Amino acid sequence: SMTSHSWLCDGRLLCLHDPSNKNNWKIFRECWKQGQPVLVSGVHKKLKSELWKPEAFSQEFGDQDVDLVNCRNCAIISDVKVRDFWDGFEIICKRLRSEDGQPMVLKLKDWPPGEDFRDMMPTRFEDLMENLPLPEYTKRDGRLNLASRLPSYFVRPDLGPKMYNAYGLITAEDRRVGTTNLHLDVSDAVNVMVYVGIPIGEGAHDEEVLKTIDEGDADEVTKERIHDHKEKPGALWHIYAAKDAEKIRELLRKVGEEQGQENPPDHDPIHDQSWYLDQTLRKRLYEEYGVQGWAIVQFLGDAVFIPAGAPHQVHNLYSCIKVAEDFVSPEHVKHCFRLT
Ligand SMILES: N#CC[NH+]1CCN(c2cccc(Cl)c2)CC1
Numbered sequence: 001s002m003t004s005h006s007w008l009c010d011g012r013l014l015c016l017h018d019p020s021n022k023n024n025w026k027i028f029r030e031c032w033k034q035g036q037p038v039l040v041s042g043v044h045k046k047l048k049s050e051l052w053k054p055e056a057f058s059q060e061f062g063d064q065d066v067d068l069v070n071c072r073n074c075a076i077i078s079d080v081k082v083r084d085f086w087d088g089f090e091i092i093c094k095r096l097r098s099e100d101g102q103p104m105v106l107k108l109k110d111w112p113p114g115e116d117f118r119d120m121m122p123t124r125f126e127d128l129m130e131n132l133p134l135p136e137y138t139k140r141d142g143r144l145n146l147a148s149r150l151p152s153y154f155v156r157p158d159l160g161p162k163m164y165n166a167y168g169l170i171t172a173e174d175r176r177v178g179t180t181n182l183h184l185d186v187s188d189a190v191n192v193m194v195y196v197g198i199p200i201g202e203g204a205h206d207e208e209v210l211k212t213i214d215e216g217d218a219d220e221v222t223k224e225r226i227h228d229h230k231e232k233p234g235a236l237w238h239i240y241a242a243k244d245a246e247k248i249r250e251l252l253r254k255v256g257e258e259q260g261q262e263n264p265p266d267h268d269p270i271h272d273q274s275w276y277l278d279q280t281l282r283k284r285l286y287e288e289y290g291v292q293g294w295a296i297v298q299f300l301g302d303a304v305f306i307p308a309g310a311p312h313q314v315h316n317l318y319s320c321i322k323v324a325e326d327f328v329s330p331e332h333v334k335h336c337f338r339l340t
Pocket residue numbers: 198206225226227229230231232233
């Protein structure tokens with residue numbers, strides 16, 4: 001039977017089922033006030049699927065100049081054409097190769113660039129913004145979005161949205177690498193999975209994905225969602241409460257010193273965006289500092305709500321197109337205030 005919502009993370013994560021239900025705010029606002037992330041499923045069913053395909057981005061925008069990142073070693077591939085990324089998104093025999101002769105796991109950096117999404121892709125901009133869940137929070141002029149209403153005593157988010165495009169991580173060694181390293185944002189955000197590409201040709205990485213989910217600490221109901229085999233999994237997230245950010249900084253200063261890094265006692269390993277918490281580090285955070293997080297598998301059409309100040313990291317299981325919008329809820333406005 002259709003239902004309004006369910007729970008993941010053993011009851012610690014709200015999952016809303018109908019992205020356009022006018023009563024979602026009643027269930028959402030209690031969890032949100034407590035500093036929890038929230039998941040909303042089904043947004044892909046609201047969108048024009050032909051606007052969110054890799055082949056369309058390559059056809060329309062392929063001659064633009066861009067930089068890529070090699071996810072395995074953080075090397076920058078400078079000043080290549082955006083088609084060199086898009087044409088290898090699903091077809092492994094078309095990917096740029098490292099020296100070792102393997103196909104690379106690449107991230108497309110800052111594309112569309114800065115605040116240019118709306119000007120470059122007006123039809124994509126309209127399709128996303130008209131279908132975002134919790135619209136009183138997430139639309140540029142929603143009644144519960146303070147972004148347009150705050151003085152300069154508050155850090156205001158840039159004009160969005162922002163697209164996040166990267167290949168899936170493949171090997172056993174890749175399990176310890178991030179697509180996006182551990183960081184935090186002073187604004188709230190909603191991140192929507194608009195396309196998942198599951199490859200062919202050398203796309204025999206389905207088996208190692210079914211060991212990542214597990215070691216990633218995903219709950220039994222999420223696992224039930226993986227093992228049912230009805231929906232496409234895109235990315236594994238770990239999110240931590242804003243209140244636990246300093247304890248995470250303490251762990252990462254201890255680990256940096258153990259690994260012979262030479263850092264001042266006050267430096268900020270979360271702002272540096274240089275760490276990915278692997279299974280070893282997540283267990284050390286729990287055992288040594290008493291910190292628990294949320295392990296979230298984002299499927300096609302899932303919207304992840306990330307609270308302001310909450311440290312978070314992202315690991316792509318398959319090739320993903322994500323689109324994110326920043327907003328400033330009244331519940332979390334303290335995180336962007338410039339004093340005390
Ligand atoms: N729409 C659709 C059909 N989908 C094909 C891909 N399926 C898949 C493939 C690899 C891993 C996991 Cl968990 C799921 C899900 C069903």
